DNA sequence: TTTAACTTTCGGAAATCAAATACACTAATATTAAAACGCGGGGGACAGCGCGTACGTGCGTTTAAGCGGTGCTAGAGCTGTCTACGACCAATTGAGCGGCCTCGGCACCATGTGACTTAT
């Protein structure tokens, strides 16, 4: 058995734990912190990737592309607050009317 | 063949339990600095306009941009190996403010000897 396996999360929480270790965020790394934040990250990735799926459906290209990613993330009004100053590579910009 | 997760522990952390302040607010109070009603105003900001203008709008001949070979070498990234350098321990200090003391100087009772005296 593995900690990354029993976590039931895609991203390996062991990697997150040791990243927190070398990241100097504190002297001890609470074992629930990496798994919790890994799950939060996985949900946010799920948001981006269900947007990817429906953008692939809308644009008829089965595999998601950065244009679709930029368009969907810029249409995500609440998420743009998190990613306001953020910008995406090769994504262009959403059309202004 | 190399990035992990078992573990096998343990000694600082992060809970707990507690009382010591102490601070916030919920609140009376007459005052009283600013609010907010209330009418003109200037002043200005927008309606409407002429015609000048300035950036597109449109052709000719250029120019660079883009490839497309032709090296070649400067670093990429990696050093395999020697320290240095800093993280730990501790000693190696120290200074500052209480502690004892201990200086010498007073007031007071003890002790011996020089008068002298007397009854030896």
From Swiss-Prot:
GO molecular function: DNA binding; protein heterodimerization activity; structural constituent of chromatin
Modified-residue entries (N6-succinyllysine), positions: 6
Post-translational events: Phosphorylated to form H2AS128ph (gamma-H2A) in response to DNA double-strand breaks (DSBs) generated by exogenous genotoxic agents and by stalled replication forks. Phosphorylation is dependent on the DNA damage checkpoint kinases MEC1/ATR and TEL1/ATM, spreads on either side of a detected DSB site and may mark the surrounding chromatin for recruitment of proteins required for DNA damage signaling and repair. N-acetylated by NAT4.
Compartments where located: Nucleus; Chromosome
Keyword Magnesium part of the UniProt annotation: no
GO biological process, alphabetically ordered: chromatin organization; DNA repair; heterochromatin formation; negative regulation of transcription by RNA polymerase II
Key words, A-Z: Acetylation, Chromosome, DNA damage, DNA repair, DNA-binding, Isopeptide bond, Methylation, Nucleosome core, Nucleus, Phosphoprotein, Ubl conjugation
Keyword Ribosomal protein recorded: no
Gene Ontology CC terms: nucleosome; nucleus
Annotated positions of the N5-methylglutamine modification: 90
Induction remarks: Transcribed during late G1 and S-phase, repressed in G2.
Functional note: Core component of nucleosome which plays a central role in DNA double strand break (DSB) repair. Nucleosomes wrap and compact DNA into chromatin, limiting DNA accessibility to the cellular machineries which require DNA as a template. Histones thereby play a central role in transcription regulation, DNA repair, DNA replication and chromosomal stability. DNA accessibility is regulated via a complex set of post-translational modifications of histones, also called histone code, and nucleosome remodeling.
Miscellaneous: In contrast to vertebrates and insects, its C-terminus is not monoubiquitinated.
Subunit comment: The nucleosome is a histone octamer containing two molecules each of H2A, H2B, H3 and H4 assembled in one H3-H4 heterotetramer and two H2A-H2B heterodimers. The octamer wraps approximately 147 bp of DNA.
Similarity section: Belongs to the histone H2A family.
Record remark on domains: The [ST]-Q motif constitutes a recognition sequence for kinases from the PI3/PI4-kinase family.
UniProt protein name: Histone H2A.1
Portion of the full sequence shown: 17 to 113 of 132
């Amino acid at each position: 058995q593995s900690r990354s396996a029993k976590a039931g999360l895609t991203f390996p929480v062991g990697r997150v734990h040791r990243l927190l270790r070398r990241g100097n965020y504190a002297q001890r790394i609470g074992s629930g912190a990496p798994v919790y934040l890994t799950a939060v990250l996985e949900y946010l990735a799920a948001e981006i990737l269900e947007l990817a799926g429906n953008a692939a459906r809308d644009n008829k290209k089965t595999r998601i592309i950065p244009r679709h990613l930029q368009l969907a993330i810029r249409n995500d009004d609440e998420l743009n607050k998190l990613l306001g100053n953020v910008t995406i590579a090769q994504g262009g910009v959403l059309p202004n009317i």
